[PDB]
Design a protein around this ligand. Structure first.
Ligand code: SAM
Ligand code: SAM
Lengths: 133, 133
């Protein structure tokens, strides 16, 4: 299983120390530049307000299985958290499209470090992404 | 980027012909067996009711950029859908944990074909995975 990057992220977060814990609590604007060879996968995306972005957290550790979430004292499995470190550092964010510039998207709520590779983008859908509780 | 398979899915969905398009609409129970090597990642997962599962749709086409959803006539980009076919066929599911054995989890709302590779697991979080509109 080999992932082929379909784009790259451009944001104001250069290092792990600059990006927000969770993009939903930040007003920072990020850019998703999809590669020309995949650009055609954006057809009619301007009809969407919210999308799901999967990116690769390249500087994250891939052999860490236990972590202490911020504010916590004891460790827990990474699969029970949103920590960047995990066997497959896939960053998952629900973002809001603010603009569509050809093969580039201006969005907010994305918390990827500048330069992070983009893996996939899907339609955000309340009925399947949200749990009524 | 290369993905490490952290587990395998066991489900009653053999092929795309008997699999729910969206697992949230099915009541079928699926099992996620994580390889011992990553077992530590499940530490304290029994304390959760909902988690997000990322799996690899290994029999899906990776060279389609457009598709026509079931209840649709016009085609749109795969990045505006939840369709299997896309550059990186990663299935995304919010699931409900019914049971936790040792390295195995029985959940519902998963729509992975039987034997599909598991890629990642994250805690489900309303405030970030769901948009309040
Ligand atoms: C908690 S993660 C977001 C995880 C996402 N909500 C998810 O569910 O997968 C955001 C943090 O990961 C770090 N991060 C973002 N992009 C990264 C990258 N390309 N490599 C390493 N770390 C990254 C940032 O420092 C940021 O504070
Ligand atoms: C629409 S996809 C699920 C997408 C997921 N809910 C998401 O948000 O990314 C589910 C469909 O893809 C197909 N599918 C599931 N697992 C697969 C696999 N391992 N290989 C190929 N196709 C698969 C099944 O036929 C099923 O009806």
């Amino acid at each position: 299983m080999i992932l082929k990057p379909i784009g790259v992220v451009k944001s104001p977060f250069k290092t792990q120390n600059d990006a927000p814990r969770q993009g939903r609590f930040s007003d920072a604007v990020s850019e998703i530049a999809i590669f020309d060879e995949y650009a055609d996968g954006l057809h009619k995306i301007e009809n969407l307000r919210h999308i799901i972005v999967l990116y690769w957290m390249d500087k994250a550790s891939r052999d860490k299985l236990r972590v202490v979430p911020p504010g916590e004292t004891e460790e827990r499995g990474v699969f029970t958290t949103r920590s960047p470190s995990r066997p497959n550092p896939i960053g998952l964010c629900v973002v809001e499209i603010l603009e569509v510039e050809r093969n580039r998207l201006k969005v907010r709520w994305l918390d990827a470090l500048d330069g992070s590779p983009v893996i996939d983008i899907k339609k955000y859908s309340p009925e399947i992404d949200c749990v009524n509780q």
